[PDB]
Amino acid sequence: IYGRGSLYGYRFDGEIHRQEAQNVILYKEKEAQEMAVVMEKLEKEIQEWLKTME
Amino acid sequence: PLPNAVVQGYTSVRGPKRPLDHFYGRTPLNIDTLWHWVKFPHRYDNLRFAVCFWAFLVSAHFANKKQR
Numbered sequence A: 001i002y003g004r005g006s007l008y009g010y011r012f013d014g015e016i017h018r019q020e021a022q023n024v025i026l027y028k029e030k031e032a033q034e035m036a037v038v039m040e041k042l043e044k045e046i047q048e049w050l051k052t053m054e
Numbered sequence B: 001p002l003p004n005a006v007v008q009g010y011t012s013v014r015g016p017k018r019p020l021d022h023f024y025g026r027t028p029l030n031i032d033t034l035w036h037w038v039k040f041p042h043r044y045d046n047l048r049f050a051v052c053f054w055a056f057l058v059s060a061h062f063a064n065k066k067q068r
């Protein structure tokens, strides 16, 4: 009780707080999915620009 | 209210009751004669103080770490 700071039970436990890990997994999947597309676009642009000028 | 037979415990004749055995040479063993063998805890009281302190402290440590 003294260490928790709560007289009833722990806090930040529960599916409302546990689900955030799975939300992070999904968010990271989406973020990498979009970042790969953006990196491919930028790489195509750079490979065009350099070999046209350089 | 009640007849004398119920009060005195017999209708006609008072029956002899077998007395209680004593077991000479040793202490009586009954539900009320157990403090002869089991006194209140008196040997590990200071250890109780120490262990209560350490239990409180360790519980608080791990609970705070879990919460944080």
Ligand SMILES: CCCCCCCCCCCCO[C@@H]1O[C@H](CO)[C@@H](O[C@H]2O[C@H](CO)[C@@H](O)[C@H](O)[C@H]2O)[C@H](O)[C@H]1O
Pocket: B001, B002, B006, B007, B008, B009
């Ligand atoms: C008062 C208003 C009108 C209502 C009257 C009736 C009230 C009845 C309720 C009270 C009952 C008391 O019941 C009481 O039980 C005990 C049991 O321990 C009986 O006890 C009897 O039996 C025991 C053994 O069992 C015998 O060893 C003992 O000598 C004898 O007294 C009492 O004789 C009886 O009086």
Ligand SMILES: COCCOCCOCCOc1ccc(C(C)(C)CC(C)(C)C)cc1
Pocket: B036, B037
């Ligand atoms: C969960 O509760 C356990 C209930 O069972 C109680 C077990 O009781 C067995 C106790 O065994 C003994 C036997 C003898 C003794 C002696 C006679 C040596 C004690 C003495 C010398 C203090 C009278 C003590 C304990």
